[PDB]
Design a protein around this ligand. Sequence first.
Ligand SMILES: CC(=O)N[C@H]1[C@@H](OP(=O)(O)OP(=O)(O)OC[C@H]2O[C@@H](n3ccc(=O)[nH]c3=O)[C@H](O)[C@@H]2O)O[C@H](CO)[C@H](O)[C@@H]1O
Length: 370
Amino acid sequence: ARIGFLSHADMSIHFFRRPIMQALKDMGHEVFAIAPKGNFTDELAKSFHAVTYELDKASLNPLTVINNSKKLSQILGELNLDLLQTGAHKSNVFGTFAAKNAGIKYVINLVEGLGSFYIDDDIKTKAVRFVMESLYKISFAKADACVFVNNSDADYMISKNLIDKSKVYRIKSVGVDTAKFDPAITQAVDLGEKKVILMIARAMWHKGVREFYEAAEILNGYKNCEFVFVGEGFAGNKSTADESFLKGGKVRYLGARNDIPQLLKASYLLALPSYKEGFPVTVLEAMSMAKAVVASDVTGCNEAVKDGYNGLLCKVKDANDLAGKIKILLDDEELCARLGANGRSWVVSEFDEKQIAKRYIEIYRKFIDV
Ligand SMILES: CC(=O)N[C@H]1[C@@H](OP(=O)(O)OP(=O)(O)OC[C@H]2O[C@@H](n3ccc(=O)[nH]c3=O)[C@H](O)[C@@H]2O)O[C@H](CO)[C@H](O)[C@@H]1O
């Protein structure tokens, strides 16, 4: 009944792990949110036991990653956890080494997208991918189970003999609060009298930001549409567009936001031209808002979006095709509503966060008493 949730980022605890954690709290367990300090740490402390720690998130310096993870082992050791849920690569691998060195008996892993080491193909990145995969064989072997939020990541990692089918659990998506993300109780943000083409994302190039801005250029307000981008960029990051790029195109830039339901209600459709995903949550949120989606035909996107059912798929790294799919929906309002209505019907039946959370807890029940 002492259950930790380790992440590299408090965003993942607050946005993804939370419904699991709430369900365990409501059952009378002690739930720990273990993540570096961030914008959500203080409110999370009110609900759960916040634990912070230092991390060079993107660094691959060996002695930095040894020291980071040794300190981490001590922080985890002092919590006296019965089970630790990790998520994403650094916590799955090094969080597991540190968890076992700290004497934690049960470690559950979680893969939610394979990330940029499978987008890039430069030799340096092909070597990094090899090492991480070889480390994963050890870390998975030490952990008791791994949850996958899509099928392609599980299939892939099984095919590389990184983990036995026995330990793979497929829980599709991290779920969405369909009662909060409900159009009937949501008041739209006012963005004018325009057909809003909404993209929600951290401004990673690997998220398709450039293609989205190029497509805005191509359509240039066709049928009174307006491209709108929600999310943060960063300065001096090669992996990221800066605010000067995000403010300099035919896109209305809103920066970070907390009224996503309200923004989705004001939108005509949601675009996600990502290069690679796990099970994109902005897609789930758009679906719960009964909004059609236009998404790249890539990993993750093509499991959350079924072409012709709840959205349309476009080629990746292709602004013209992205624009083309958007124009088809701008040209055909009845189709766009039908797809969004199917999107709503699907989230409600398969992706509500409450049933998703219950299925994580059944995995834990195999190992500890809940
Ligand atoms: C591999 C990858 O590229 N992405 C995956 C990764 O996290 P990502 O962080 O890439 O997931 P994402 O970008 O889909 O996260 C979106 C979440 O952030 C929220 N938001 C975003 C912008 C903003 O200004 N305000 C705001 O509140 C939004 O409401 C939603 O809850 O893990 C997720 C959880 O399973 C999904 O699998 C994604 O597919």
